[PDB]
Amino acid sequence: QKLKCECQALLQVAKNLFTHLDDVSVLLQEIITEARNLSNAEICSVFLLDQNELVAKVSYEIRIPADQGIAGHVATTGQILNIPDAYRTRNILCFPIKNENQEVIGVAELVNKINGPWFSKFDEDLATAFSIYCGISIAHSLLYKKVNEAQYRSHLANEMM
């Protein structure tokens, strides 16, 4: 009954992240909201690998080394990381994003469980499940910005002729 329920859940969320491929910024937000209710986190932050560093702008912009701290490790290693006690902190569930291959393309971390000591070791396969849709959507979402950006500059020039 639960298993069946975390799909309709995901079915939902899949259909919500895919209605924002338009805006990597709105999309990036959705991923956060959704990621927070799905796992029931106090807070989620999302980092998008920018070459050799993590950028979770999430509004300001926050750079940092891609291999530094929690985010950096998980990003480096490409494998989830669960924390019971981190030592209003407490716990942290942090997971990779990776693209079509398995190239971690971003990273997200949830802090503190609501109604709980930590993250259900089920809150991981569910996070991994979600995390496929985040990588699928971020990947295309960025790949679509690149075009629109370029293609725009292309005409800024052409209206010049």
Partner: protein, 171 residues
Amino acid sequence: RLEECNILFELLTEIQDEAGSMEKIVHKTLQRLSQLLAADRCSMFICRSRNGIPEVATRLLNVTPTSKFEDNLVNPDKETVFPLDIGIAGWVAHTKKFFNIPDVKKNNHFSDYLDKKTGYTTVNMMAIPITQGKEVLAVVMALNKLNASEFSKEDEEVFKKYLNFISLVLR
């Protein structure tokens, strides 16, 4: 074996791509056994060991046709452990034998520790060990027959029928 094929297949379509689904399967099977046996509840004790010392521990309690898995799953922190020389559950694990106990008050081996803690009154019981070779993985029981003074011989046959499946799943 018609209605078993259907019950099991349909059951397996209700299991979310998630856990831990192997225990959600055992749970759902147990929920169906409750219906088929008119058993007040079913339970499972996991059986493990520590340096050659086996023991039996609460895992799924109070499984019921309208019962939630996360309510039935015993929290690892709060799990009641028995040595195999205490309890019918531990005895089943020790002997690797099936038992249809009609009155727990007339069966030494019966341990009333969980009844005292949980407040539940256990009267009669079927109990069966799930094995892998010479080692035991779990003990499953159906407690308190609702529509008769005890579980029938026929009831043994149904329980045993569904516990080939649970066995398979618990591997």
